[PDB]
Write a protein that binds this ligand. Structure first.
Ligand SMILES: Nc1nc2c(ncn2[C@@H]2O[C@@H]3COP(=O)(O)O[C@H]4[C@@H](O)[C@H](n5cnc6c(=O)[nH]c(N)nc65)O[C@@H]4COP(=O)(O)O[C@H]3[C@H]2O)c(=O)[nH]1
Ligand SMILES: Nc1nc2c(ncn2[C@@H]2O[C@@H]3COP(=O)(O)O[C@H]4[C@@H](O)[C@H](n5cnc6c(=O)[nH]c(N)nc65)O[C@@H]4COP(=O)(O)O[C@H]3[C@H]2O)c(=O)[nH]1
Lengths: 164, 161
């Protein structure tokens, strides 16, 4: 099947599939009088995990992450993995306060429970940047603003959310 | 219209009027009609010890917390007394039970402000899914009965049936 729109490892959307889904969400969003929020998150200290315990361990962390995230969001919310240890969500909401709240939700639940990697339990946190797609703003533009907030989130110490 | 004057929530009439529409909706998205039936615990004690204005305020804050604790499409109603009925489309009763306990918890999490008087309140609920072609009223009764068991068991308690 023409399933090259998925991330093989986690079965989430990949960068390409994610970007194609934008337009239709723009439709839905204007439709239901909602806003389009992006949450861009990244697993903290991922190399440390990988280099220390091996690629399988890291792939395990990634799989557990994708799963927790998927489970913490409504069915219609887009969730993707572009590569590395980063998960990007797109949610239809009313205002940014709600987006931040969703972001810290994901963050806390990732922090709340360690992850089993071949009998070795590994504690992980996640950082996120999040923003609303501006009125008449293009998709990539908002994505980059969220990527940049994520950067600031890492710099500010990690395990935190930066709403912008 | 089809509203409870006091709280501007649906009344028994408004409830039954939407039901058939909720059936159609539930069928479309392969969901089940969930009913949560709840009653404020020890409500007369409040009315007596602080007055009908107070009792009426507690009722107003509940409608507001409940309503804020559900999604817009979830039906929230007050038939009368101090009881709030909710109708929510879901896929299995564990989900209905969680929703119920959530409402219960937030009701207990914060006293209710009665004009410079914060009063602790709790709520009890009984919940159930409607069977295929079941009369709303039958489902209503089953949840009302579980609500009763929840009261008899000690209140501040959910009974899923
Ligand atoms: N697309 C999307 N939107 C989200 C998500 N989480 C939150 N929101 C939005 O943010 C609003 C406020 O959410 P809230 O503070 O959690 O406050 C929530 C929450 O207390 C309650 N609640 C509603 N649905 C659920 C649920 O499926 N699980 C849990 N635990 N609580 C819920 O209802 C309140 C408001 O319901 P809403 O009117 O729907 O209002 C929501 C909703 O539009 C999400 O994962 N995806
Ligand atoms: N109509 C209706 N259905 C409800 C309500 N609450 C829960 N559900 C349903 O119950 C499922 C699981 O809820 P969950 O355990 O809280 O697990 C939730 C929860 O962690 C997260 N969550 C989703 N929306 C919200 C929200 O608005 N606020 C908060 N705090 N959490 C949410 O998404 C997870 C699953 O989302 P779902 O796929 O949508 O799946 C949901 C959803 O179908 C409600 O107030 N109204």
């Amino acid at each position: 099947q023409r399933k090259s729109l998925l991330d093989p490892l986690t079965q989430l959307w990949n960068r390409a599939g994610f970007h194609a889904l934008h337009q239709h969400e723009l439709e839905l969003a204007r439709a239901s009088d909602q806003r389009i929020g992006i949450i861009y998150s990244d697993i903290d200290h991922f190399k440390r995990i990988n280099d220390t315990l091996g690629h399988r361990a890291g792939d395990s962390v990634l799989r557990e992450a994708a799963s927790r995230l998927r489970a913490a969001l409504r069915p219609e919310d887009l969730l993707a993995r572009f590569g590395g240890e980063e998960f990007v969500a797109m949610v239809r909401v009313r205002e940014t306060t709600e987006l931040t709240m969703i972001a810290n939700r994901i963050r806390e639940l990732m922090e709340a429970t360690p992850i089993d990697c071949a009998g070795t339990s590994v504690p992980v946190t996640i950082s996120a940047g999040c923003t609303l797609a501006g009125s008449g703003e293009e998709p990539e533009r908002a994505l980059a603003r969220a990527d940049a907030a994520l950067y600031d989130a890492k710099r500010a110490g990690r395990n935190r959310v930066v709403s912008v």
